[PDB]
Design a binder for this molecule. Sequence first.
Ligand code: RIT
Ligand code: RIT
Ligand code: HEM
Ligand code: HEM
Lengths: 457, 457
Amino acid sequence: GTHSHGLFKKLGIPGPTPLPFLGNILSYHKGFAMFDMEMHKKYGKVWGFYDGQQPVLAITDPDMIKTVLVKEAYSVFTNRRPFGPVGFMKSAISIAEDEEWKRLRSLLSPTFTSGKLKEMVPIIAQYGDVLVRNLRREAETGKPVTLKDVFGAYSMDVITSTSFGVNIDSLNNPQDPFVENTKKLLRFDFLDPFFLSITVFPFLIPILEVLNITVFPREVTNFLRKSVKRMKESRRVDFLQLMIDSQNKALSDLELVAQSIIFIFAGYETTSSVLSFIMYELATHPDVQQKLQEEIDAVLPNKAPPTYDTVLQMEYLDMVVNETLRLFPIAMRLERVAKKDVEINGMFIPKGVVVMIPSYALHRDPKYWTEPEKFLPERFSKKNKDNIDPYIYTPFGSGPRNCIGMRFALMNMKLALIRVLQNFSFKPSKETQIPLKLSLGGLLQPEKPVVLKVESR
Amino acid sequence: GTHSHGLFKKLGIPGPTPLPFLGNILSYHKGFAMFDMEMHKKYGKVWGFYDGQQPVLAITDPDMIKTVLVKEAYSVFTNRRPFGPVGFMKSAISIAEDEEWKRLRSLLSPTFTSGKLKEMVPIIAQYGDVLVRNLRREAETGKPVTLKDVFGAYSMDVITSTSFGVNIDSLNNPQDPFVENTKKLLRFDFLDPFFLSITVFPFLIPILEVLNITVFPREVTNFLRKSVKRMKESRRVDFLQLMIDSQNKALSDLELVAQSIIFIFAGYETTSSVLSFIMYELATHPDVQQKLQEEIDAVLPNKAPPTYDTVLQMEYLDMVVNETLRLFPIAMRLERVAKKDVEINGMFIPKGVVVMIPSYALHRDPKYWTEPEKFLPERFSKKNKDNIDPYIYTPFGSGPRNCIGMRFALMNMKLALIRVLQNFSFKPSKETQIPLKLSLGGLLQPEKPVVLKVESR
Ligand SMILES: CC(C)c1nc(CN(C)C(=O)N[C@H](C(=O)N[C@@H](Cc2ccccc2)C[C@H](O)[C@H](Cc2ccccc2)NC(=O)OCc2cncs2)C(C)C)cs1
Ligand SMILES: CC(C)c1nc(CN(C)C(=O)N[C@H](C(=O)N[C@@H](Cc2ccccc2)C[C@H](O)[C@H](Cc2ccccc2)NC(=O)OCc2cncs2)C(C)C)cs1
Ligand code: HEM
Ligand code: HEM
């Protein structure tokens, strides 16, 4: 029906007029980001819309954003927008709620410290070499390289190793039952058929749950499920034991598996998308690539192996990474649910409303960014960075619920970039789409995969 | 989703563009009839639209109409558009399908013959008087009469008596458990919340069925359910025994009850709506009322009691009744489902499509009717009637599935009119809405009830 559809009318908040049942979902025909930018330009700092019957309050005010993601996090905006059905995956940290979440966050918080992460480099760099060897091969038969595939396999390599102790050159081995299963853990597309229907029929979620149907394909999960059985363990620098030790408030077995699936995915798919986009930028801006190559050679003599401290010394590398994250956040939106009524920065918001920060739109707003469409690493130099509002630029979220893997992701990505840029230069191929276009779907991804010419140095 | 929504595109049939999930239902915001007239004027003789995902093919071609309602009735278009949930009411003749239907149609066919119907007049006329006595009272305190209430109670009186043997002046007795229950059997409004949702979620019907939820309120049905227990019977001119005799292919007990509910309703609600609309027309056209009064006095001397044959002799009465039915059909649409694929008059129609004849629109079409908006009984005189296409004018449907009660309805209505017009004249009250407006909802009914000044003669 239409019971919820008078809400934003009642509070006097502007927004697209909802259709019965569908709310505003039809506006998603060209993707979240384009919907969010259209609505932002058309309504200013705040607006409201309905996913089916679910009210969503978009906010773009930096101070209101700090309020939701930080100040009122524990007391009001503790959880993300429920999404389901998920079976045992209800226990994964990113999905968990309230006290089950804070528990898992504490339990897993020590996994991603500079110390551990420091010990993860001699591992994460051994697969630096394999990627380079792989790349050099595919650059001797000098034909276009699909970044998502080569980075994909590196990305898988790194997490399987740092989290489970499993070494596999996944690129050559697309047939290892471990490689194939994990690959199938891809990001969910919220504008796909199944998810549109489940937004317009949330009253069906509990029906799917009962039938043990899940958004996480069962074949994928069940493998990884007991896959840790003889793996955890033979009865050191591994996410696994780092979690096993936390068992003997302590972590249950089926919860532990749910954490591993969550991570496997992250260190795999997020990482490889971002890496692809950086190389795309580097390839379409040779001067930036050359300046980056010079920072790398200067900090690391004759192809010297990167270390924890050398990585962190590279300023221009940091600016490149950040500037690619500005233009291509993997999140697009950040979201919390109000467990109770709230008044924030003068705005009343009833219990159950989804408050949504549209990062993609904010990352491209003319008010906060000069020439926001352009790839300009200099935006993040020492001179200009203090300019940037930490609640406008949020590629890893903010507050107690931000990305737990942030430091690992940044590190792992830069290690990859260094090893690759030390040995190669990248250039547009004939088939490189320029300018690149993002999938009109529900994921910040290229419609056509990035392909690039790889030249040895 | 949208799987069915390419159908009419595939067959090359014009029609409003469907929205995902909703199909065209939003077009119902101003009622079926207005939707059907808009679409007819805008697409000509045939068009297609979707109720949620259900395809509906509207047809206005007289010959194509004879094809659906008559020629291909038994072989293709045997059933009406399924509608549910209905519990045991699946067994009622108007809802029954295929062979269960033809069975019930044969079994109940002899109930409505000129002979039986002839024996039903000394009964149907005894309540002629009560209505007159009631009317005279409410015309001595000369204040406006709400037709739907006075006719309503007469309408109930007549069927309770002719079908069950229950005499009750229902108007004075709105407290008899028999009166109140039956009253609650009102026509279903297809554009009401519950029915809109169930058109956009037909996959929920079987869920409602399982929970014993029905469109026929349970309290209403259960009373009438066993209400016939000590009634059928004490172990003559009554629909009841007429059905009991057919038991001892023969009619089951719970089926019999389902038939009685179906009838009770019909002889009650259809009858009283039509009677109200005729009086409205008579009141807004005094000359027609006076001519009608003169036919009646001429055929029936000094307030002489109407008989079966006298009723049928009154030509101008027939034209009035028919002309009111033209302007205000109770059906609005007629519908059949294609059980199988079919090609009709050169048009292919796949299995499962609802073929819909929009009577309200057809009854008002400038191609078939001069000044179609105007109440002109003369349209149906001996001179002009043979003009009228029997597949354009269909107030009682056509073919093997037409109104089984037609002759009883026509008779019962005319008996009422004669007894009323012999004694009174009707006139607009101050509050009479003129011109009348039909509920923008899902039923041909007045938004504001007809109220009229009743003057004794
Ligand atoms: C009500 C129902 C119809 C709904 N379902 C959904 C699910 N869909 C499609 C989403 O895109 N949901 C989004 C989401 O992914 N939230 C997520 C946190 C997040 C948000 C943005 C960017 C990065 C991480 C929270 C979810 O638990 C996801 C689900 C998941 C798990 C494994 C593999 C794939 C996917 N888990 C993760 O965080 O993935 C690991 C990652 C870690 N860091 C970056 S990605 C929300 C921001 C809306 C939304 S609404
Ligand atoms: C799929 C689902 C969502 C749907 N449900 C519906 C139900 N609704 C609201 C309707 O208006 N359905 C219509 C209908 O009433 N069909 C009907 C035949 C008919 C059609 C038009 C005019 C007169 C009789 C067939 C149904 O069985 C009705 C239902 C009913 C029973 C008792 C009391 C009230 C209502 N039974 C009757 O015929 O009522 C007794 C009458 C006899 N003569 C005139 S009315 C159809 C023409 C569409 C349509 S689609
Ligand atoms: C470039 C790569 C990555 C980006 C851009 C990224 C970004 C994000 C963002 C935006 C969020 C949501 C923050 C919020 O709601 O405020 C998030 C959550 C999360 N990320 Fe990542 N992430 C990346 C890689 C990783 C990796 C490698 C891991 C490894 C485990 C990881 C684990 C998580 C977890 C567990 C959460 C949810 C934490 C919680 O709810 O408490 N992420 N990430
Ligand atoms: C003025 C009053 C009435 C009108 C205008 C009317 C009109 C109609 C119409 C249009 C139909 C559908 C026909 C079709 O699909 O082709 C119908 C069906 C029916 N009517 Fe009536 N009707 C009236 C009164 C009655 C009465 C008093 C009864 C008494 C029992 C009755 C019993 C039925 C039945 C049983 C059906 C369905 C028959 C079947 O499916 O086989 N109707 N009517």
